[PDB]
Amino acid sequence: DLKSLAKRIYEAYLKNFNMNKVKARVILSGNNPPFVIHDMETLCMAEKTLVAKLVANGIQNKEAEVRIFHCCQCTSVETVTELTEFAKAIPGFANLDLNDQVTLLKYGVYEAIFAMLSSVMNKDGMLVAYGNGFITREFLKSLRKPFCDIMEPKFDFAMKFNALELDDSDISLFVAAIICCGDRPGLLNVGHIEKMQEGIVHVLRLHLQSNHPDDIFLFPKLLQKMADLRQLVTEHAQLVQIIKKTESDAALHPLLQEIYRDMY
Numbered sequence: 708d709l710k711s712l713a714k715r716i717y718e719a720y721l722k723n724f725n726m727n728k729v730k731a732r733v734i735l736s737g738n739n740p741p742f743v744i745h746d747m748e749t750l751c752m753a754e755k756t757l758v759a760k761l762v763a764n765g766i767q768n769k770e771a772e773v774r775i776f777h778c779c780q781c782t783s784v785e786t787v788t789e790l791t792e793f794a795k796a797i798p799g800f801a802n803l804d805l806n807d808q809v810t811l812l813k814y815g816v817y818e819a820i821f822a823m824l825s826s827v828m829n830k831d832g833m834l835v836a837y838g839n840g841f842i843t844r845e846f847l848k849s850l851r852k853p854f855c856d857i858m859e860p861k862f863d864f865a866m867k868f869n870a871l872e873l874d875d876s877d878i879s880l881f882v883a884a885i886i887c888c889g890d891r892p893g894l895l896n897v898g899h900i901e902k903m904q905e906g907i908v909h910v911l912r913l914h915l916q917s918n919h920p921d922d923i924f925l926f927p928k929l930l931q932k933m934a935d936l937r938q939l940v941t942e943h944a945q946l947v948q949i950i951k952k953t954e955s956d957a958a959l960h961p962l963l964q965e966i967y968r969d970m971y
């Protein structure tokens with residue numbers, strides 16, 4: 708039954724996420740090729756084509772860094788929606804109390820976002836805007852503080868994560884495992900969540916044994932990556948709070964304020 712479960716999870720991931728690692732790699736290899744954003748000129752050209760409304764305000768347009776952060780947030784909002792539908796495929800998740808489902812998604816979504824973001828990153832940049840842009844790592848590093856500090860730690864995570872050479876069948880189960888954590892704050896039915904976690908981690912362990920016979924440590928490596936992601940998210944939330952206190956024009960999306968509320 709466990710092999711079928713792993714396949715169910717994988718198929719739900721292919722159905723629910725607009726981006727997957729095969730799709731990303733086709734684009735990254737070289738109709739509607741990605742526009743390269745490597746400097747301010749190319750950022751502004753890409754915006755006029757791909758997010759026209761955001762730059763249709765004349766002198767009232769926000770600063771480039773703020774527009775970029777707004778696009779970051781919109782991407783995360785969309786991935787939250789995808790993750791919420793994906794979670795229905797996880798055995799036991801839809802049987803939990805609605806409040807526990809909310810709590811698991813609240814604490815898990817950014818860990819999952821940063822894990823999956825690795826699939827659209829290479830050492831030089833990342834896919835954005837539904838695969839229609841490629842923004843360079845160096846351009847993001849060139850932004851004014853604090854905005855240049857957003858992406859670089861995610862690239863650092865992603866380069867090591869990508870060196871594990873996971874595929875979509877592994878990543879789908881890793882994301883399911885992130886969502887099923889019994890130690891999130893405020894859970895009502897910890898015991899049932901712990902059982903759900905044990906089941907999905909068992910599926911993950913057996914799948915990695917079968918799909919990666921060459922890497923006998925891969926399961927504990929991925930357990931460590933989950934802990935690393937929790938630290939990456941805590942640090943990300945600290946930076947977002949700096950932006951919220953010091954950058955008045957950088958409006959925080961109403962759906963993401965709730966995810967951050969009483970996190971770190």
Ligand SMILES: CCCCCCCCCCCCCCCC(=O)O
Pocket residue numbers: 750753754757758775776778779780782783784824835836840842947
């Ligand atoms: C014209 C397109 C500009 C694109 C600007 C960069 C888009 C990055 C998308 C990935 C965001 C990852 C970080 C999310 C941060 C957050 O939600 O707090």
